């Protein structure tokens, strides 16, 4: 299994959530984060500001999934979250060593 | 060392926080997230809704710990956070490559 | 590439954000978390409390970066976020398997 961390623009969330619902995905956790850098009209991180803020609110999605379906998920996320403009974000895939369902105390083969 | 990411039901947090306090754990960070899918009365993710929301607020706990004690922590979390009902969540263990204490600039053996 | 997760004291954020801006870093996501344990005047996690809270609000920064520059980032973070007091936090570096830019559907060599 692999973990996917996609930090997308907050308004794509539904289109993405729905698209993954179609590809057989169940279970998703969304974190609201502060995005820094890579924004329209700007070409500077930090910037100082004083009265202005330097962040663009973002949405981080997290999902662990089998290796086989990894490419469907990334291919689908890129499809539903991409605008072709600055600020689209990235997808990072990490390797999970173990995954246990709390309700049963039962583990999943982290190698599938 | 290994990292444990448990997304539990928000009301189990204390029972878990306390139980890990007993097993020698120090240091924990809690993130409040939006949980999607696997909920009572529902059998659909996304769902559309319109006026209804589709998420159940969750609590994500994060802790890095030695390999030896990994199983005590998961065994303890399952014990304190499990309700035997739908929505209990999962525990994911990841491998940490490096861990540095900011205060000293001192590193820990990430292989213990 | 490697992922850096630094949970610092919330007031160091700017000094850190700026320092990384100088070292060539672009892109950062900040999550506001609840920090548990390791606090001045306290020597107990959980504590029970009743009317008191047991957490200290923290700031989690996340950045994926090339392997070569990993040590500049950790060395810089320790420099800008360290107070030499209790509660400074840690930096954890994880290995990223894949990183895709959503806007182009283009991947980066996760091995650099």
Swiss-Prot record, chains A, B, C:
Processing after translation: Uridylylated/deuridylylated by GlnD.
GO biological process: regulation of fatty acid biosynthetic process; regulation of nitrogen utilization
One GO CC term, this protein: cytosol
GO molecular function: ATP binding; enzyme activator activity; enzyme regulator activity; identical protein binding; small molecule binding
SUPFAM superfamilies: GlnB-like
Keyword set, alphabetical order: Nucleotide-binding, Phosphoprotein, Transcription, Transcription regulation
Keyword Nucleotide-binding: yes
Highest rank taxon of the organism: Bacteria
Modification O-UMP-tyrosine, positions: 51
Record has Transcription as a keyword: yes
Subunit organization: Homotrimer.
Protein family according to the UniProt entry: Belongs to the P(II) protein family.
NCBIfam families: PRK10858.1 (NF008111)
Role of this protein: P-II indirectly controls the transcription of the glutamine synthetase gene (glnA). P-II prevents NR-II-catalyzed conversion of NR-I to NR-I-phosphate, the transcriptional activator of GlnA. When P-II is uridylylated to P-II-UMP, these events are reversed. When the ratio of Gln to 2-ketoglutarate decreases, P-II is uridylylated to P-II-UMP, which causes the deadenylation of glutamine synthetase by GlnE, so activating the enzyme.
Full protein name: Nitrogen regulatory protein P-II 1
Record organism: Escherichia coli (strain K12)
Gene behind this protein: glnB
